[PDB]
Write an enzyme that holds these catalytic residues in place. Structure first.
Site, PDB file in Angstrom:
ATOM      1  N   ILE A  32       0.799  -1.235   0.000  1.00  0.00           N
ATOM      2  CA  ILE A  32       0.000   0.000   0.000  1.00  0.00           C
ATOM      3  C   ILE A  32       0.833   1.287   0.000  1.00  0.00           C
ATOM      4  O   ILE A  32       0.278   2.384  -0.084  1.00  0.00           O
ATOM      5  CB  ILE A  32      -0.993   0.035   1.189  1.00  0.00           C
ATOM      6  CG1 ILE A  32      -0.285  -0.294   2.509  1.00  0.00           C
ATOM      7  CG2 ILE A  32      -2.135  -0.941   0.950  1.00  0.00           C
ATOM      8  CD1 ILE A  32      -1.084   0.070   3.743  1.00  0.00           C
ATOM      9  N   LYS A  34       5.261   2.972  -0.520  1.00  0.00           N
ATOM     10  CA  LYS A  34       6.674   2.786  -0.830  1.00  0.00           C
ATOM     11  C   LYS A  34       7.431   4.082  -0.546  1.00  0.00           C
ATOM     12  O   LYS A  34       6.847   5.166  -0.549  1.00  0.00           O
ATOM     13  CB  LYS A  34       6.832   2.381  -2.300  1.00  0.00           C
ATOM     14  CG  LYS A  34       8.233   1.953  -2.714  1.00  0.00           C
ATOM     15  CD  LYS A  34       8.264   1.553  -4.184  1.00  0.00           C
ATOM     16  CE  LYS A  34       9.684   1.365  -4.696  1.00  0.00           C
ATOM     17  NZ  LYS A  34      10.320   0.122  -4.175  1.00  0.00           N
ATOM     18  N   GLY A  35       8.727   3.961  -0.285  1.00  0.00           N
ATOM     19  CA  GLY A  35       9.583   5.126  -0.078  1.00  0.00           C
ATOM     20  C   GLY A  35      11.033   4.717   0.078  1.00  0.00           C
ATOM     21  O   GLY A  35      11.353   3.536   0.008  1.00  0.00           O
ATOM     22  N   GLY A  38      11.788   2.059   2.734  1.00  0.00           N
ATOM     23  CA  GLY A  38      11.411   0.679   2.456  1.00  0.00           C
ATOM     24  C   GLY A  38       9.990   0.621   1.930  1.00  0.00           C
ATOM     25  O   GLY A  38       9.609   1.426   1.079  1.00  0.00           O
ATOM     26  N   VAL A  40       5.557  -0.468   2.778  1.00  0.00           N
ATOM     27  CA  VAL A  40       4.462  -0.636   3.729  1.00  0.00           C
ATOM     28  C   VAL A  40       3.456  -1.594   3.118  1.00  0.00           C
ATOM     29  O   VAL A  40       2.995  -1.388   1.994  1.00  0.00           O
ATOM     30  CB  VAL A  40       3.752   0.695   4.044  1.00  0.00           C
ATOM     31  CG1 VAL A  40       2.597   0.466   5.017  1.00  0.00           C
ATOM     32  CG2 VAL A  40       4.737   1.709   4.609  1.00  0.00           C
ATOM     33  N   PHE A 105       1.621  -1.346  12.612  1.00  0.00           N
ATOM     34  CA  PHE A 105       0.702  -0.273  12.942  1.00  0.00           C
ATOM     35  C   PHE A 105      -0.747  -0.738  12.829  1.00  0.00           C
ATOM     36  O   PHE A 105      -1.039  -1.791  12.262  1.00  0.00           O
ATOM     37  CB  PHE A 105       0.928   0.923  12.009  1.00  0.00           C
ATOM     38  CG  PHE A 105       2.241   1.626  12.225  1.00  0.00           C
ATOM     39  CD1 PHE A 105       2.403   2.515  13.281  1.00  0.00           C
ATOM     40  CD2 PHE A 105       3.311   1.410  11.368  1.00  0.00           C
ATOM     41  CE1 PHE A 105       3.605   3.169  13.482  1.00  0.00           C
ATOM     42  CE2 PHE A 105       4.521   2.062  11.561  1.00  0.00           C
ATOM     43  CZ  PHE A 105       4.670   2.941  12.622  1.00  0.00           C
ATOM     44  N   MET A 107      -4.221  -0.441  10.973  1.00  0.00           N
ATOM     45  CA  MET A 107      -4.514  -0.244   9.550  1.00  0.00           C
ATOM     46  C   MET A 107      -5.397   0.985   9.353  1.00  0.00           C
ATOM     47  O   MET A 107      -6.540   1.015   9.814  1.00  0.00           O
ATOM     48  CB  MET A 107      -5.214  -1.481   8.979  1.00  0.00           C
ATOM     49  CG  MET A 107      -5.498  -1.432   7.483  1.00  0.00           C
ATOM     50  SD  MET A 107      -4.011  -1.485   6.462  1.00  0.00           S
ATOM     51  CE  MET A 107      -4.694  -1.098   4.850  1.00  0.00           C
ATOM     52  N   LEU A 108      -4.865   1.991   8.661  1.00  0.00           N
ATOM     53  CA  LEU A 108      -5.614   3.203   8.349  1.00  0.00           C
ATOM     54  C   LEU A 108      -6.114   3.168   6.905  1.00  0.00           C
ATOM     55  O   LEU A 108      -5.850   2.214   6.167  1.00  0.00           O
ATOM     56  CB  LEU A 108      -4.741   4.441   8.593  1.00  0.00           C
ATOM     57  CG  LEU A 108      -4.180   4.619  10.008  1.00  0.00           C
ATOM     58  CD1 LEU A 108      -3.299   5.854  10.070  1.00  0.00           C
ATOM     59  CD2 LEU A 108      -5.287   4.711  11.050  1.00  0.00           C
ATOM     60  N   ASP A 154       7.747  16.967   8.686  1.00  0.00           N
ATOM     61  CA  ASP A 154       7.362  16.681   7.300  1.00  0.00           C
ATOM     62  C   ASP A 154       5.847  16.515   7.175  1.00  0.00           C
ATOM     63  O   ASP A 154       5.358  15.566   6.560  1.00  0.00           O
ATOM     64  CB  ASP A 154       8.101  15.433   6.786  1.00  0.00           C
ATOM     65  CG  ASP A 154       8.056  15.302   5.267  1.00  0.00           C
ATOM     66  OD1 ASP A 154       7.822  16.316   4.572  1.00  0.00           O
ATOM     67  OD2 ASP A 154       8.250  14.179   4.769  1.00  0.00           O
TER      68      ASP A 154
HETATM   69  C1  LIG Z   1       6.147   6.325   5.515  1.00  0.00           C
HETATM   70  C2  LIG Z   1       5.172   5.670   6.491  1.00  0.00           C
HETATM   71  O1  LIG Z   1       5.493   5.506   7.666  1.00  0.00           O
HETATM   72  N1  LIG Z   1       3.992   5.326   5.937  1.00  0.00           N
HETATM   73  C3  LIG Z   1       3.020   4.758   6.655  1.00  0.00           C
HETATM   74  N2  LIG Z   1       1.856   4.430   6.109  1.00  0.00           N
HETATM   75  C4  LIG Z   1       0.966   3.869   6.948  1.00  0.00           C
HETATM   76  C5  LIG Z   1      -0.271   3.448   6.648  1.00  0.00           C
HETATM   77  C6  LIG Z   1      -1.088   2.884   7.622  1.00  0.00           C
HETATM   78  O2  LIG Z   1      -2.343   2.448   7.331  1.00  0.00           O
HETATM   79  C7  LIG Z   1      -0.593   2.773   8.911  1.00  0.00           C
HETATM   80  C8  LIG Z   1       0.689   3.219   9.176  1.00  0.00           C
HETATM   81  C9  LIG Z   1       1.433   3.752   8.215  1.00  0.00           C
HETATM   82  S1  LIG Z   1       2.976   4.350   8.274  1.00  0.00           S
END
Ligand SMILES: CC(=O)Nc1nc2cc(O)ccc2s1
EC number: 2.7.11.23
Length: 343
Positions: A32, A34-35, A38, A40, A105, A107-108, A154
Site C-alpha cells: 500500500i 513505498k519510499g 522501504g 508498507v 501499525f 490499519m488506516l 514533514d
Molecule cells: C512512511 C510511512 O510511515 N507510511 C506509513 N503508512 C501507513 C499506513 C497505515 O495504514 C498505517 C501506518 C502507516 S505508516
C-alpha cells in the site's frame, strides 16, 4: 546476483509476495506504500484477528537506524495516558523478520492527498476542513507535551491518514523524518510546499514549523490546490511573499539565507532581488479563500456553514498559523480556543 538469500531485491527491499505467511501469524495481502525507507504492506494478524499495516524497513544499516529512532518516538508517545495520543498512528509492536525491521501499525485508510485527488483538486468543504483542523491542532498539542517536544518535520497531505473511509477521524503517520527539539542538526528539512520561512531563511526553528505546514495544509484542503507551490526555494519564498508580504526586517537582519531571496537596499529596507510574481502581499488569502464570493472559485456559494462570517473565522486562524514570527505564531492550545472551532 542473490540478495539476502533471494528475499531482497538489488535495492535492499523485501520482495513482497501476496498471500505469504509470516511467523505463523501475519498474512500478507498487498503493498500500500513505498519510499526510501522501504515498503508498507497491508496484512492480517491471525492472533489479534484484525488487519494491520506493516512497515518493512530496508535491509541496510542507514535505514535501520532511522526506523529505530521512529520506534523510540512512538514507544515514548504511548507511555502517555492522554486520549490525544490517538491522533497519532499507534505502533502496536515491532520485530526482526528475514533481516528487516518490521513496525506493526493499526490499519488506516486513504491519506488527505488521495482525498484531494478524489475532488479533482477542488478541495473538500469548510465543515470537513474544520474537523481536520481541530484534530491536527490536538495532535500538535500532544507533540508539544514538554517531555515529548517532537517536531514531525514533514507534515503534508500524504502524511495525514483517515482512520476509516466513512469517517472524518484522522491520524498523522511517518515519524522517521522527525527533527526533535534541541541542538540544530538539520537545515534542509520539511517538504518544500510546506517549508517554513525560518527554515527557508536558515534560522533556528522549533515546533512552530509544524503549525506553518498545517496553515498551508488546511488552505489546500479547502481550495484543493497547494497554497505555496514553489518549484524551488526562490520560487517558494516568492509565493510566500506574494500572499504575506515582505518578511519583517527584524527577522531578515538575522537570517543567514536572507541574500538568497532578498537584497538590503541603501535605505536599510529589504526587497525581493529579481530573478513573474504579484507585488508584495497583494495575492490576498481573503481572495484565495473566496471569503465574500462564495468560497474557492465560487463553488461553495449557498452551502451551509460557508457564510462570510465562517470564512473570516477560518481566514483569521490561518493567518495566525502563517505568522512570520515563530514566537508569536499561534500555538496548539490557543488555536483550539479559536472561534472557528467554537460551538
Ligand atoms: C512512511 C510511512 O510511515 N507510511 C506509513 N503508512 C501507513 C499506513 C497505515 O495504514 C498505517 C501506518 C502507516 S505508516
Amino acid at each position: 546476483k542473490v540478495y539476502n538469500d533471494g528475499y531482497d531485491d538489488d535495492n535492499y527491499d523485501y520482495i513482497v509476495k501476496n498471500g505469504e505467511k509470516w511467523m505463523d501469524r501475519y498474512e500478507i495481502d498487498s503493498l500500500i506504500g513505498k519510499g526510501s525507507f522501504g515498503q508498507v504492506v497491508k496484512a492480517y494478524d491471525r492472533v489479534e484477528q484484525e488487519w494491520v499495516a506493516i512497515k518493512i524497513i530496508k535491509n541496510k544499516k542507514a535505514f535501520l537506524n532511522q526506523a529505530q529512532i521512529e520506534v523510540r518516538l512512538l514507544e515514548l508517545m504511548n507511555k502517555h495516558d492522554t486520549e490525544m495520543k490517538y491522533y497519532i498512528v499507534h505502533l502496536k509492536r515491532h520485530f526482526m523478520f528475514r533481516n528487516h525491521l518490521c513496525l506493526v501499525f493499526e490499519m488506516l485508510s486513504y491519506n488527505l492527498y488521495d482525498l484531494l485527488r478524489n475532488t479533482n483538486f477542488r478541495g473538500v468543504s469548510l465543515n470537513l476542513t474544520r474537523k481536520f483542523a481541530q484534530q491536527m491542532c490536538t495532535a500538535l498539542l500532544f507533540l508539544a507535551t514538554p517531555e515529548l517536544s517532537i517536531i514531525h518535520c514533514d507534515l503534508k497531505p500524504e502524511n495525514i491518514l483517515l482512520c476509516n473511509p466513512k469517517r472524518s477521524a484522522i491520524k498523522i503517520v511517518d515519524f522517521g523524518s522527525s527533527c526533535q527539539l534541541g541542538q540544530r542538526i538539520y537545515q534542509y528539512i520539511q517538504s518544500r510546499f510546506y517549508r517554513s520561512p525560518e527554515v527557508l531563511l536558515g534560522m533556528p526553528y522549533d515546533l512552530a514549523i509544524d503549525m506553518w505546514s498545517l496553515g498551508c495544509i488546511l488552505v489546500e484542503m479547502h481550495t484543493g490546490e497547494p497554497l505555496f507551490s514553489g518549484a524551488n526555494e526562490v520560487d517558494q519564498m516568492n509565493k510566500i511573499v506574494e500572499v504575506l508580504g515582505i518578511p519583517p526586517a527584524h527577522i531578515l537582519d538575522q537570517a543567514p539565507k536572507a541574500r538568497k531571496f532578498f537584497e538590503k537596499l541603501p535605505d536599510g529596507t529589504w526587497n525581493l532581488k529579481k530573478t513573474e510574481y504579484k507585488p508584495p502581499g497583494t495575492r490576498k488569502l481573503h481572495n484565495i479563500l473566496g471569503v465574500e464570493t462564495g468560497g474557492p472559485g465560487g463553488r461553495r456559494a449557498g452551502e451551509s456553514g460557508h457564510t462570510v462570517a465562517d470564512y473570516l473565522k477560518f481566514k483569521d486562524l490561518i493567518l495566525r498559523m502563517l505568522d512570520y514570527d515563530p514566537k508569536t505564531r499561534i500555538q496548539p492550545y490557543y488555536a483550539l480556543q479559536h472561534s472557528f472551532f467554537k460551538k
